[PDB]
Amino acid sequence: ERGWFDILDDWLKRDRFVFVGWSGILLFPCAYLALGGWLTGTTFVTSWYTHGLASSYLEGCNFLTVAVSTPANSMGHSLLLLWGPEAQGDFTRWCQLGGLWTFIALHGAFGLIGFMLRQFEIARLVGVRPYNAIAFSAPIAVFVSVFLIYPLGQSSWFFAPSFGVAAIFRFLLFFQGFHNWTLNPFHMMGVAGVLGGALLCAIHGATVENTLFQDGEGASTFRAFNPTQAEETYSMVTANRFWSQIFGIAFSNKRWLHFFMLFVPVTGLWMSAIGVVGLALNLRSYDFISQEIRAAEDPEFETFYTKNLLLNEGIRAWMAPQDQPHENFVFPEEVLPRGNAL
Amino acid sequence: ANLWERFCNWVTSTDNRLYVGWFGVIMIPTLLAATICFVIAFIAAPPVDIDGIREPVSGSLLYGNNIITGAVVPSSNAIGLHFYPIWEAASLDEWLYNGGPYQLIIFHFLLGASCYMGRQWELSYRLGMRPWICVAYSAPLASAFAVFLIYPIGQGSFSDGMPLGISGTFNFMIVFQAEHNILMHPFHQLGVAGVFGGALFCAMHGSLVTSSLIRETTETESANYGYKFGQEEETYNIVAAHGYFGRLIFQYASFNNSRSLHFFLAAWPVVGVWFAALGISTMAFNLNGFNFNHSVIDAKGNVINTWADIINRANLGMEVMHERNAHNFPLDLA
Amino acid sequence: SYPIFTVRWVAVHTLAVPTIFFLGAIAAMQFIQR
Amino acid sequence: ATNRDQESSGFAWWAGNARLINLSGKLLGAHVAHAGLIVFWAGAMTLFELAHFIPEKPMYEQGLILIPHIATLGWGVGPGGEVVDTFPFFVVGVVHLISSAVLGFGGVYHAIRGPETLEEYSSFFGYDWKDKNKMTTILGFHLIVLGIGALLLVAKAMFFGGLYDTWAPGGGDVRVITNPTLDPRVIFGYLLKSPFGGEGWIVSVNNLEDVVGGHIWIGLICIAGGIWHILTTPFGWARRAFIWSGEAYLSYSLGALSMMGFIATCFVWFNNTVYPSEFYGPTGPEASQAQAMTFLIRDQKLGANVGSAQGPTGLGKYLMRSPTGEIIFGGETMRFWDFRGPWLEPLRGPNGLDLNKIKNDIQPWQERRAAEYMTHAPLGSLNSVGGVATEINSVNFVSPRSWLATSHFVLAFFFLVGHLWHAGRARAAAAGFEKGIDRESEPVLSMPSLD
Amino acid sequence: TTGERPFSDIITSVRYWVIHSITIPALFIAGWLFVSTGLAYDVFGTPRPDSYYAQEQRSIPLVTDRFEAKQQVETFLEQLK
Amino acid sequence: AELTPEVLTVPLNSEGKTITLTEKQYLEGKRLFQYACASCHVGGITKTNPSLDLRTETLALATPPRDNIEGLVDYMKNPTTYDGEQEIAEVHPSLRSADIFPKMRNLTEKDLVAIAGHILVEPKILGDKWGGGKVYY
Ligand code: CLA
Ligand code: CLA
Ligand code: CLA
Ligand code: CLA
Ligand code: CLA
Ligand code: HEC
Ligand SMILES: CC1=C(/C=C/C(C)=C/C=C/C(C)=C/C=C/C=C(C)/C=C/C=C(C)/C=C/C2=C(C)CCCC2(C)C)C(C)(C)CCC1
Ligand SMILES: CC1=C(/C=C/C(C)=C/C=C/C(C)=C/C=C/C=C(C)/C=C/C=C(C)/C=C/C2=C(C)CCCC2(C)C)C(C)(C)CCC1
Ligand SMILES: CC1=C(/C=C/C(C)=C/C=C/C(C)=C/C=C/C=C(C)/C=C/C=C(C)/C=C/C2=C(C)CCCC2(C)C)C(C)(C)CCC1
Ligand SMILES: [Cl-]
């Protein structure tokens, strides 16, 4: 059977400069629209009616302060379809109500699905194991938990991260003040996975580059490697002795070494995603009850834990009126927490 | 074979289970001193007047801390940058009140860890290796110098050095944001690119090499037994890896030279962390992140807020609350 | 010898055509006064 | 194209300047062309600063780093550091700019026109990196030049108008230095001071007599050692301790420059004698003490007894004791009590700040100086918004001390990395394994196993 | 290789540059005019410097209803006189 | 909203005469204020003495009143304490003390009017932000 399905399959999988594939039907429009939506919004679209903020090059923001901001809190978790009951097919209103945000988030989510399908598709055609796709589940877990599950647990999309450099920084600081997110052990594991991944990246790169075999005469050692050579280009035996004597332990199985390099950052991101699922419900690691009972009763008891809560309280009271304008917070000067003088 | 030559041949011997070396002669006593003091102080040290206002902060386990809240507390603001060894105190009880232990730990640690870097150079010379693994280690080492030494120098006190503890780290980071807006500094942003990128490329390289392992095992055994320590032949097919990844993106976005690939793995996080360290070190001298507070103004002159101004609101709350009893005059100039 | 209109040609231009248009729009914004 | 591709030289283009290692004639050109770049920047930057300079604003409000260097030497300024004549700034810039063309000319000639190697053309200018006698002789020539340079500063100070003295009675003035400190216990005593708070190593030099006498000692020492290294060749203990190669020599200098960059970073951050605050703005310690002083003065004028005002913590609101008893300013500036400055020292007694002088002898010029330095604290953003990170836009200011300190820390750090890079490579190249491990001779395969 | 013409071939060819010395500046100018004619403001609904606020008000025109949000913005736009 | 002549109309003196500044004067006032004054008065506060700000309500209760052009121009010539009892030229920049505050040497009478105008117009724009300090940033 060589029907139209099989002929289409032929064309989708041609060896061209940009492989397309069946996965490409999902991947390419969704990635392109998500990227074009972010560039369109950061260049031209305001956040005045949803946040009370300027947020586009048009308004005078720069690369650090432009954003595609989340919709107004009053939209709830609305899909905010262009043809939906809020914008009612009006493109200009849609932009003013935050329709670009759900547009980017949703085309982005389906774009990410399409990229991971692409990793499976190409891997099956070339004949390799699909571990690169398996590794990409960690970025997907992060995107889905932070940009979708987290706001879905909260009151509205407004509290999702906005798509911008400084807007994401605000998101970091909000998570410290309101959630005490540095205290959360699922974040701690994520930090370990990311910093340990960066560590493994640097050390393995440096170990290979400094246990190279002399396979050429030039002082530039890059030329003395051939992609189809059968020999290892660096000395596993010398690398193992160096680290055993510097550090006490070393790798001895190169297949374990590279699996571990997959394992560490991937597991870390997955752990951080679980903690954010909890924060969707405000199920925080905010306090240590034992510390609070002691400190309530003993005004001489002070730790770095109690000091940081005071900082969190400052963040909440000083940023909440501007950061949550729909709540209409009026905090007179006299209720604001402040140390002496400052 | 006199006794000095014998000692030198033992110190520099490549047959010791752990290499000693001349750097190791400094490294071992200083690291031992810093480690022993850290463990004892973390468990049992009494509270410490970090900010010099007779307001001691409890850092140890026996005085009410758990693993997450505990810390070795930085030395007193009254001491500033003065040297405070045990023998400058009238008693151990004084030394402990004033944060003596913090100085002893970090000075021994910074010495020991600098010698750790020299030791990496030294063993590579004895084994006939190329010498630059220690250049990769200079990036974490510079970062430790930034938060334990350079930042106190510029701010004028070891009491603004990073505490030796988990929650103390977070305190250091939060106050740093209030006083320098580090998130808006391009060197911290390059640092984030260094570690996010380094973790990305870590999983990238791990998954590609793992995806192209050459079949050497049955399905009931670990694929790891398909590699034998010291074997001459490579254990994966880099041509197949390049064939996959080149099609994932495009052909010329993919490495086929293992040497330049592994150099890129080395350089990206190391350079990024160098910039992170230089961020901390230059904000030590108060060259702070970008300030776009009230940068956008309308036709009449009303301030139009941006996300930068929301950051500023957060930073103010951090500023007005930190060290709540330590400021008498309106400007926190250091 | 070579074709002119390929998949690669389309991919290049869906990116490059809006980029130039946007760069002109952002260039003009540098002369807006309040 | 002698050694001008990767095949002939072994070095790729991105290490292309390594192709010069044994081409002394082209290497001379590279060095002379580069010195011209340095002299160019010095001349052009000065002219730029002068063009952009308004004499009624303090230098430190104008982004100036070179004019403060010239003014400190006593050119163009009078009492209080006021600018009386900008023509010396013009001269210094013009003469540097003109000279860079001479150096640019020599550099371009030797680099692309003259003899590629110098050994055939002249045995005086020729050299072999491994010739320990020729290398120490070239080193000796340059030590003599440096020694003369240090004596030019002495000549300016003692015979050609003097130096700007921030400490001069009457508010700061240019002063001829007639008795420079020659006592080697003073001069070399600076070298044995602790580098920690209250001591400050050589960064603590606080008077021009010591600055000038130190340059007399350094000039003599450099000239002597320069003669010594022309006449001698390295001894056996030195021969066995070092690597003798171009790259090795480069790496020693990189280590030395890195060390000096770190010292310069601290000099400009703490020292207000050879970096006068009139020109560079107040130090960080200085501005923080000036805030305490400003509010002691304000509150005392309103009727406060500042000696006995107990602050919220139990420590004095305005005044307290240092850990050794000296009377010092209170609040967070307690960390800065080691600060010494001309506007503050009149209030100082044997026991530290004197309450009687505080009550009766504070002059309006001290109130002025303290308010000016409190509001020009060296804090500001990368886009030059002055003040704490939470301040709003209005004031276009970053102190010269922050510019000079941050740039020289960054430079010193990378120069330390460069030392490690080239010292490690020099060692490996000398021993013969900088291109990789020889497969047939892998040293680890001849060693006993660890376990 | 995948069969398409090398990029270095194309972008050093006179014909490439004859075509693109027109199409590139023409797009740039189209983008400039999208802003300079004020059309970008009206397509996307972005305030001009003089239309964030009414002359004496200092409250944000914040959307507060889900299904009448369109009418709320339109009402905020009328009140600009 | 726009910078209108109404916004730019400010009290000239205590008797109720107004003067209408141009946009050029206002913008010149802002630049000269930044040049000579904002190091202590950024945003309408006073960093070396926060008890006294540049709010119009605060200026109206100074002695003599400073909430109009003539009072502010006189202050920049011969500043006084808030109750008028003392002359503070020796510690506050003014034309009288331009020898010790060199930045005042190149200010002309026209400049003083523009600075004065900026100080009186800005609260009409910024409201509580002017003289309010960090609470209103
Ligand atoms: C200060 C910076 C500096 C200096 C002084 C040099 C100097 C040199 N380089 Mg190096 N190099 C540098 C930076 C520098 N380089 C950088 C950044 C790179 C990376 C791209 C390299 C990569 C590199 C490689 C790969 C090679 C060199 C080589 C050389 C040498 C021969 C150059 C030649 O023959 O060109 C000939 C070029 C021309 C004739 C074109 C014009 C050149 C002139 C000098 C321009 C001067 C313009 C100036 C304004 C005129 C002023 C005149 C006025 C004063 C009267 C020369 C000594 C070569 C070498 O080692 O030979 C053995 C070599 O192969 N360099
Ligand atoms: C006096 C200082 C000095 C001197 C004379 C040398 C000389 C040399 N170096 Mg060393 N190096 C130094 C300092 C120095 N280095 C420092 C401080 C570092 C740490 C970063 C290094 C790190 C280093 C490495 C890693 C390597 C060398 C190498 C070399 C050799 C080849 C150099 C070359 O052709 O580069 C060519 C120059 C370039 C390709 C240009 C680099 C572009 C830089 C990064 C831009 C920097 C940005 C700029 C400051 C600001 C932005 C500008 C932009 C906005 C336009 C040559 C002998 C190579 C070697 O080992 O050979 C034996 C080599 O692999 N150097
Ligand atoms: C010692 C070096 C040094 C220092 C401390 C200063 C300091 C200053 N300059 Mg000067 N200047 C310098 C060198 C320096 N400059 C050089 C080399 C040039 C020629 C390009 C100039 C030309 C110049 C002009 C034309 C002007 C100044 C101005 C100023 C003032 C404002 C600076 C500013 O806003 O920067 C903004 C900050 C940046 C642009 C940050 C740059 C970040 C770099 C690219 C990072 C580099 C890192 C490292 C080097 C690379 C490592 C790479 C790694 C792979 C190894 C300030 C006093 C201004 C002024 O006020 O004049 C009165 C002014 O208009 N300078
Ligand atoms: C340190 C820098 C330096 C060094 C070591 C050399 C070395 C050399 N040059 Mg080069 N050259 C230089 C810089 C340098 N030059 C500069 C700046 C220029 C432009 C002026 C030239 C232009 C040049 C040309 C056109 C020629 C040379 C030639 C030579 C070779 C023979 C020169 C001779 O025998 O003079 C003998 C010594 C003297 C005549 C004494 C000169 C005293 C000077 C002029 C007075 C100043 C002395 C004082 C220390 C200067 C302080 C300057 C300081 C402030 C920067 C020799 C290898 C020749 C060559 O290559 O032959 C093939 C040749 O034809 N040079
Ligand atoms: C650029 C300057 C310079 C350079 C590169 C050299 C280089 C050299 N000198 Mg020369 N020397 C110089 C200036 C210089 N000298 C000057 C100005 C004088 C006159 C005072 C001398 C007088 C001199 C003599 C008498 C001798 C040398 C010798 C040597 C050779 C061995 C150096 C050595 O082993 O150091 C290593 C340094 C030491 C071994 C010092 C002891 C180690 C201490 C503990 C290190 C402490 C470091 C610590 C961080 C210090 C910080 C600052 C401190 C002051 C507080 C080497 C070629 C030797 C030689 O072979 O002559 C032919 C020799 O005998 N030099
Ligand atoms: C710090 C060195 C200052 C500079 C620069 C300027 N001013 Fe100032 N101002 C300062 C102080 C400490 C005070 C209080 C003085 C007192 O003891 O009463 C003031 C006061 C004023 C006032 C009076 C405010 C009021 O009465 O509410 C005005 C109108 C004023 N200052 C204006 C002003 C101008 C126009 C300046 C630039 C030319 C300027 N000041 C600079 C401190 C400092
Ligand atoms: C949304 C939407 C849509 C779409 C649209 C689109 C698709 C768009 C696209 C767009 C685009 C597509 C745009 C673009 C732009 C671009 C740009 C704007 C760029 C710029 C660049 C630059 C600026 C650069 C810079 C740099 C860097 C980055 C680095 C290197 C160096 C330099 C500096 C060069 C539709 C219609 C469907 C519907 C509705 C909605
Ligand atoms: C070798 C080489 C190189 C380098 C080069 C160089 C580095 C050079 C330099 C050069 C130089 C370094 C030059 C200089 C020049 C200068 C000049 C030419 C000047 C002139 C001047 C004048 C003309 C002046 C004028 C004036 C006056 C007198 C007055 C005031 C005003 C004015 C300014 C107008 C390269 C890398 C490229 C590569 C290749 C090789
Ligand atoms: C001017 C002045 C002054 C003076 C100064 C002086 C007098 C100085 C001196 C200086 C000096 C006098 C210095 C020295 C230095 C030294 C060094 C820096 C060394 C080093 C060493 C080394 C590096 C070694 C190494 C090694 C070892 C250890 C082992 C064996 C091998 C080797 C060799 C590698 C004063 C302050 C008064 C004042 C101000 C001005
Ligand atoms: Cl204080």
Numbering used by the authors:
A (entry chain D): 11 to 352
B (entry chain A): 11 to 344
C (entry chain F): 12 to 45
D (entry chain C): 23 to 473
E (entry chain E): 4 to 84
F (entry chain V): 1 to 137
From the paper:
Here we use pump-probe serial femtosecond crystallography to reveal the structural dynamics of PSII from nanoseconds to milliseconds after illumination with one flash (1F) or two flashes (2F).
The deprotonation of water most likely occurs at Δt2 = 200 ns–1 µs, during which time the simultaneous existence of YZ•+/YZ• and OEC+ might collectively promote the deprotonation of the O6* precursor. Consequently, the resulting OH− ion binds to Ca, neutralizing the positively charged OEC+. Another structural change occurring at Δt2 = 1 μs is the movement of the D1-H332 to D1-A336 backbones towards the OEC, which probably occurs owing to structural changes in the OEC.
